[PDB]
Design a protein around this nucleic acid. Structure first.
Ligand SMILES: OC[C@H]1O[C@H](O[C@H]2[C@H](O)[C@@H](O)[C@@H](O)O[C@@H]2CO)[C@H](O)[C@@H](O)[C@@H]1O
Ligand SMILES: OC[C@H]1O[C@H](O[C@H]2[C@H](O)[C@@H](O)[C@@H](O)O[C@@H]2CO)[C@H](O)[C@@H](O)[C@@H]1O
Lengths: 422, 405, 417, 407
DNA sequence: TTACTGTGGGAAAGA
DNA sequence: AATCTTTCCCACAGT
DNA sequence: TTACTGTGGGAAAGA
DNA sequence: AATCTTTCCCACAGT
């Protein structure tokens, strides 16, 4: 029988925080495959398992008699259509797995889709289904003039992008810009998400730089900062690459899956290049016919694509549950409401269900379900946090947490504060 | 359109005076200038400018320009050092958004108490003594006070006096989560205004024109207005005085200080013609004189003309009220703040909502990330939240990796 | 039918104050009459009618067809005895009357008593019964620390009369008429006998010391009505027909005494018919001085009973008495709501405390104690006076038939930050 | 009262054996026997015995009770020489002045301070609000945070005063015997906090002087609130103690009622000159005051010469800081009635017999005859008062003199 | 020589 | 009518 | 002279 | 035993 979460059980969780997190890292767009061709999603969608909960769950299962194979989390990935078969990901040993052979066919007439990650333990126990963020289907990258009206296909300052390189003549057909051991390299297995920041044409080279807002256009000065390590490449000028030539005379907005060139700011025609796993500089030969074009090899020709991240965090607060932990709710924002009789907190997000309750610390709130994107709760009175030795009128800060009727705890990065006023 | 300047300015300002400046520019350069005053231009401009239309130059107080800059409707103004020195540094601070100048400041304006010297030689030092003055005046077939109750700008000095505030200024920025629209101070101020209405000392239906007519006709002893209103009182047979706003609960009335600014539309193809007209024609002693002659501007941003106007007791009174008040934030949240306070003031004045319910709704409507004050058995508690951090600083610190040659 | 007082009617009364006051001025003690002898109360108990209400009532009654005899207030005075006859007092023409032939017999075994004044209009319309303050019965004046009731204290009222056996007018009284001191045959004044230090110089401003008055002490006699004072005088004991300089004994009730003018050539407070003058005393014993009958006065402590009423809702069938008298007030915070406790006399269940024109919820305990619920400050914020400011209002007792009983007490609401 | 012998009354919490040594010195010098006594409730006893014409020759108590004793005529007027008056601080003479007359000799200035155990608590709390948190920590170690006398309002007054509470307001050059600050918001907040410490088991309503003294000196409690007189017993217990500033309430300083230990001479006493001799030339000397201080500390002594030598002491330096934050008590006769009202309120609120509001409201109207009463209204706090018949007593009378003709 | 298959580039079809 | 988007086609790269 | 009647003074009982 | 209080008695005042 299912057990509702107790205050003691909640208090223990808030002290430990042995959460089980599932991360889905992917591109915001996908190119359509025509006929019987298979155009694989690039960079390959990645599934990461984070949190100390996984080890805790393994140890709990193995105390129940599970072998390492039985306690091992297993995952399958596919697009939101049944016509295509789901592909297995091998997590066993590693903390992550990348799906290298996913594609969307001409038969699939959807304009937008989400990746579906079906997780379970090796003993067939179901964990649940975790969806990615929305992926827009594109026919081909826009070979002509782009505009801010097609914002979905444009790249904005301060947003994450993935940089990959197609190498037809090389053994490793495609390499990805990644940061490992505080150094930039062209990885065959891993790919990094980089904040593409736009800067003023007069901004000098340095560790500290002022970032200007807007959509990235060709010829502009950009700083690529690693979303994980915080490592940045020196000031670069993003240029349009045509066949095997970088053109200096481009002002057009930079779009999804476009052929790129990254000229190092204030250098003798040097550009961002690749020599096997290592990234190096490349001397460009200017064309004698056109003074606006410069010759650049395949290793200097990169591909830009905007990336997204789906995150789901859960914990079995009252021990193992029969029902899967999914759909895992995600809280995007909060807003207080003074328009009514009592103070209300309005939660905006995804995957909300009637069987959830908002908790302020170890205090269960009266929760009202509206839809999967909107939930309301009655903000507890401050007296609920003055029960013991903490009776003195003082500021109180508590976490905001979603809890399912079977004791499953859905962590939030949000806190709530009661501040006494004279 | 190219080869001609289209200018938008509010109807309560010196538009005919500004049109004289346009006729001077037309006789000097040959470029035709059209001065327009459309209704609700603060709302109109962001709609027309978004599509890429509207005027070339927009005239409004600095408070709306921050949102216009965020939306990308304004051109970055880049004046020379010689020009920047001709204007007060604090006037340039009002027109600065994310380390960029987004408009040209023209004049500093604040609300003052405008009283009739014949009807009332000694104006009230406090708000609390106005109902007693009303009894005396009602016997003489007149009234004590009449001001615009449809625009929160006029009621804000009373709301701010005991403790009300828009956004708190923490460190070197405004805390877009710290709103003081439902604190005790704001509540006491709006309760007092509602009490003046409930006790028939003021009428909830009173707007700008109704109050202006009553003062200029000598029907009401006092009015709350800015420098722009002085010209019409001059034409009327009223021996008026411009003084400090009365105190509430022993504390000064804090009016919101506005800086009349001129921004250039980002979509405008006459950006140089606009810079030429604004710097060398309008922001001159002769240029600012023409506008001021129609309807007074207040304390002008141009140092040379301000010095000549400083001797005026009416401008001296405006500055005293400006000093006791506060310069408005130019932040994008200001528009949402104003709409919330407008609704609260109207609903409390009409009796539609109680003061508490009106200011509580206004509190959470003003900023999206704002708190809410609650009455508890232990006292007043401020409810707030954090953890959805989304901004990204202007400056980024990142260690440079070497690309090997 | 009786009408309850309205707020409008109360507002009018508070502005005008055309009250009807009844004053009973008498001595605190009375000497017993033995056998068949009649020892009359001296000075004679006086009944005064103060206030503009009397003339208002006269004018109202006369608009109803009453003659001057019918509208004329009539009064009878007696003691609280159903064996002794009540004496008629003649107020007709004047506003006061003295009861010159009142006495207490040996048969009346009471150790104290109050005078009973029964008032009504000539047309038989009953005003009511007004009692005096307590009068203690004494056998004879003590020519003596044990009894403070028979002693005279500094700052208390006294009457000074002169017995003249050889003169046509057997007894004269110290009184002030037309800003001058005289020995009246009809009227008598109540004088505050203030004690001062032996070094206090003569003047309009003087510092008054406390304690019981003894012989040889410097006294200042100030008229309780006009505020007129006699120059500094030394109260001396009188034995037969001589002023005693060597007397230190405490001054007691109904004592024969003289009043030597401070810093004079043996001059004493004397009388020549209706006028008071100074008498030169011939020294005879260096501690004794010869003084005539006119220089020999009699001291007696006096009291005053005051009753004020007003027909707030016009003429009333029932008498206006007993008129409640408020001695003191005290607030109470021991309960749920703020309460005002009234202490005094003649309280009835038909009474209500009013704070200005605001009728309060009144609770009757007994005739000496009354409680009421202090109105909320909002009750005084009903018009244009809604602004948070100090509010001062009179405290008034009102009867169910509209009779208003004035008080000298006010109530204050003071806003605080 | 026997002639040729001095009878002295002093409180049991003071240095009576030290004062007895001064009496032995007087006896060996003049031949006059001196008897030092410490009877229970002598502040109540003295006005009863003195009224009949009996009691001690010399009375020791804080200056606050002497005003009433003077009004009743129980005290003899103090008339010292200029040379003597200058030996003592002018403010100490101001405390013993009633109606432009000196009614007692000042001895020492005393104020309550926070006495803490340095081993149990090296850093004492700066605020009252942090004491319950310090209590949780100490309770785990089998100890408690705070323990002080809850039977005497003197000890609870610093908390009551802190936020806004006062006895009588000082208007112009006098105390307004009608303006009492016992039922205001500040006083209410202070007593509510004390009641909350009791309700939440951090303190016990039954705690008196001896109970708290035992607990501190035995090392059972981390802190105590007491005056300089209590230091001697803590010294014998060898507790590593500290004397510091009282903790703040609602961010404001705790305001203790500053007392001036004074010695008055009974008006009925036939040994007034013998009393003046003993007090001026024997007690109010460096050697004389040293004897009393050696028994139980006096605090900041009135004698300038001895105070200078004791000023270097950090405990006396702490007493003065607490005194400076507080106020010198009024000497006015209404002080006795005030104290009885606050004692009742504190006891009834702590016991749960009455709520804080009901206790402090009753105390307000019982503190003085003709005191106001505060009420909470929809418009705010309103003070209810009545312009009744206040005793007053007209001192000066203006009357035009009518002349008696010379005839 | 040819088979094996994703991938960018380019033309021709639609919008 | 352009100009942009979508669909179809094909050379290219290595055991 | 005395009768007429309130009044202070004084003596002789009581407390 | 004092000292104070109460009760009874009487001279005095001018027609
Ligand atoms: O009432 C809200 C309104 O206040 C201010 O507008 C003022 C303006 O600054 C003055 O120059 C004058 O025109 O009166 C206006 C109010 O009627 C703010 O500037 C504005 O943004 C806001 O909506
Ligand atoms: O508690 C009421 C009480 O407080 C004061 O007494 C103090 C005294 O001043 C100190 O020197 C020491 O002895 O402690 C006493 C408290 O027990 C007032 O002086 C006193 O009048 C009041 O009743």
């Amino acid at each position: 029988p299912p057990k509702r979460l107790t205050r003691e059980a909640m208090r223990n969780y808030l002290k430990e925080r042995g959460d089980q997190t599932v991360l889905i890292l992917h591109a915001k767009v996908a190119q359509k495959s025509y006929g019987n061709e298979k155009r694989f999603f690039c960079p390959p969608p990645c599934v990461y398992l984070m949190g100390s909960g996984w080890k805790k769950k393994k140890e709990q299962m193995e105390r129940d008699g599970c072998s390492e194979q039985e306690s091992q989390p297993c995952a399958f990935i596919g697009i939101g259509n049944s016509d295509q078969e789901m592909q297995q990901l091998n997590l066993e040993g590693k903390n992550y797995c990348t799906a290298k052979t996913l594609y969307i066919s001409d038969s699939d007439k959807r304009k937008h889709f989400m990746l579906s990650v079906k997780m379970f333990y090796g003993n067939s126990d179901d964990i649940g289904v975790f969806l990615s963020k929305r992926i827009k289907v594109i026919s081909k990258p826009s070979k002509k003039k782009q505009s801010l009206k097609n914002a979905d296909l444009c790249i904005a300052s301060g947003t994450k992008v993935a940089l990959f390189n197609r190498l037809r003549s090389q053994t490793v057909s495609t390499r990805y810009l990644h940061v490992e051991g505080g150094n930039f390299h062209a990885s065959s297995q891993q790919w990094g998400a980089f904040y593409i920041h736009l800067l003023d044409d007069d901004e000098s080279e340095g560790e500290e730089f002022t970032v200007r807002d807007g959509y990235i256009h060709y010829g502009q000065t950009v700083k690529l900062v690693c979303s994980v390590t915080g490592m940045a490449l020196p000031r670069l000028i993003i240029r349009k690459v045509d066949k095997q030539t970088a053109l200096l005379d481009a002002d057009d907005p930079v779009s999804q899956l476009h052929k790129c060139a990254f000229y190092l700011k204030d250098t003798e025609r040097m550009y961002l290049c690749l020599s096997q796993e290592r990234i190096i500089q490349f001397q460009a030969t200017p064309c004698p016919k056109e003074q606006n074009k410069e010759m650049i090899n395949d290793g200097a020709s990169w591909t830009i694509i905007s990336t997204d991240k789906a995150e789901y965090t859960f914990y079995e607060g009252m021990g193992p549950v029969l029902a899967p932990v999914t759909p895992v709710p995600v809280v995007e924002s909060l807003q207080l409401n003074g328009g009514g009789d009592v103070a209300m907190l309005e939660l905006t997000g995804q995957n909300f269900t009637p069987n959830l309750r908002v908790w302020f610390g170890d205090v269960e709130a009266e929760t009202m379900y509206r839809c999967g994107e909107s939930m309301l709760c009655v903000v507890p009175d401050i007296s609920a946090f003055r029960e013991g030795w903490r009776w003195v009128r003082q500021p109180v800060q508590v976490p905001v947490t979603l809890v399912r009727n079977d004791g499953v705890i859905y962590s939030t990065s949000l806190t709530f504060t009661y501040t006494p006023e004279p | 359109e190219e080869g001609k300047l289209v200018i938008w300015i509010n109807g309560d300002k010196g538009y005919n005076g500004l049109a004289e400046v346009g006729k001077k520019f037309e006789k000097d350069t040959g470029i035709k200038v059209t001065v327009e005053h459309p209704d609700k231009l603060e709302e109109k401009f962001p709609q027309v400018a978004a599509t890429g239309d509207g005027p070339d130059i927009i005239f409004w107080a600095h408070d709306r320009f921050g949102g216009y800059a965020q939306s990308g409707l304004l051109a970055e103004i880049t004046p020379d050092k010689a020009f920047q020195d001709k204007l007060y540094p604090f006037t340039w601070d009002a027109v600065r958004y994310n380390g960029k100048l987004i408009a040209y400041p023209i004049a500093v304006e604040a609300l003052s108490l405008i009283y009739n010297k014949d009807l009332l030689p000694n104006p009230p030092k406090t708000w609390e003594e106005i109902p007693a003055l009303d009894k005396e005046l009602k016997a003489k077939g007149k009234s004590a006070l009449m001001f615009n109750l449809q625009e929160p700008y006029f009621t804000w000095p009373l709301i701010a006096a005991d403790g009300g505030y828009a956004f708190k200024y923490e460190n070197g920025k405004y805390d877009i989560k710290d709103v003081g629209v439902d604190n005790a101070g704001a509540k006491a101020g709006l309760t007092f205004l509602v009490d003046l209405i409930k006790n028939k000392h003021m009428n909830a239906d009173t707007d700008y024109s109704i109050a202006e007519a009553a003062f200029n006709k000598g029907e009401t002893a006092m009015t709350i207005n800015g420098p722009w209103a002085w010209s019409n009182i001059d034409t009327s047979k009223v021996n008026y005085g411009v003084t400090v706003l009365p105190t509430f609960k022993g504390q000064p009335s804090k009016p919101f200080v506005g800086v009349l600014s001129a921004g250039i539309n980002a979509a405008s193809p006459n950006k140089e013609l606009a810079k030429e007209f604004l710097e060398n024609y309008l922001l001159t002693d002769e240029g600012l004189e023409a506008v001021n002659k129609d309807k007074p501007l207040g304390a002008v941003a141009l140092k040379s003309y301000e010095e000549e106007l400083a001797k005026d007791p009416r401008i001296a009174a405006t500055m005293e009220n400006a000093q006791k008040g506060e310069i408005m934030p130019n932040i994008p949240q200001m528009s949402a703040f104003w709409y919330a306070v407008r609704t609260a003031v109207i609903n409390a004045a009409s009796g539609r909502q109680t003061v508490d319910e009106a200011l509580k709704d206004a509190q959470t409507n003003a900023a999206a990330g704002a708190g809410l004050r609650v009455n508890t058995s232990e006292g007043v508690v401020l409810l707030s939240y954090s953890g959805q951090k989304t901004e990204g600083p202007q400056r980024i610190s990142a260690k440079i990796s070497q690309i090997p040659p």
